[PDB]
Amino acid sequence: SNKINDALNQHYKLNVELGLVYAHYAHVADDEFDMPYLGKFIQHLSEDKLGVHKEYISDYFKRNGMKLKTDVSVAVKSIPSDAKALIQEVYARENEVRDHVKAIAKLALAEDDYESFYFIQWYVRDGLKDLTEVDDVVKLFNSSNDKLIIEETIKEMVEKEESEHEIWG
């Protein structure tokens, strides 16, 4: 499917640009908001988008004959005003990821592309996983007014040896 090749190239592009924006947001979290642990959490998110998220698509393309396209433009011209808004912006991006992944799964079924529907199940699962982790961080800013209390809870999230849920892990 050229439709599937296109939607998956779009998703590759979305994960690259997300990764670069999060790298910037990670820098701002520490450097401007004095929240280094919030920065590491977002930095880890950035390396996931620029890592397996994009690399699994290129690996898939090499298996099935689809064409990879690298066409990337992103610029960070405005920054959220504080840390809560920063992680709220992260949340909004991840929510849009779940929607685009939903379109790809729907399209693979429309095309009877059962290899692509299999492949996208990983991204269906991770769409909810990543959103859960970010939402666990959003809740902190409404559970405490002390930025060092929040930082301590993020520290444990980031340093947790993360044992993986039977379904969503």
Q: What is the binding site for Cl ion (CB under 5 A)?
A: 33, 75-78, 82-83, 106-107, 110, 122, 125
The span from the CA of 79 to the CA of 1, in Å, is: 38
Angstrom distance (rounded) from CA 28 to CA 39: 8
Q: At what angle do helices 36-48 and 83-110 cross, to 10 degrees?
A: 20
What angle separates helix 2-31 from helix 114-141, to the nearest 10 degrees? 20
Look-up of token digits 């090499």: 62
DSSP state of 124: H
Of residues 68-97, those binding a second copy (CB under 8 A): 68-76
Helices 54-64, 114-141: axis angle to 10 degrees equals 180
- For residues 163 and 160, what is the distance between their CA atoms, to the nearest angstrom? 8
Q: Among Fe ion, Cl ion, a second copy, none, what does residue 164 contact (CB within 5–8 Å per kind)? A: none
- Which residue stretch of 69-77, 96-104, 128-136, 150-158 sits at the interface with Fe ion (rule: CB under 5 A)? 128-136
Distance CA 39, CA 22 (A): 9
Q: Which does 95 bind (CB under 5 to 8 A by kind): a second copy, Fe ion, Cl ion, none?
A: none
The piece of 2-10, 15-23, 84-92 that touches a second copy (CB under 8 A) is 15-23
2 or 119: whose CB is closer to a second copy? 119
Q: Does 150 bind Fe ion (CB under 5 A)?
A: no
Minimum Å distance from CB 31 to Cl ion? 11
Site for Fe ion in 23-62 (CB under 5 A): 26, 31, 43, 48, 58
List the one residue from 81, 106, 162, 169 that touches a second copy (CB under 8 A). 106
- Binding stretches for Fe ion (CB under 5 A): 2, 5, 26, 31, 43, 48, 58, 82, 126, 130
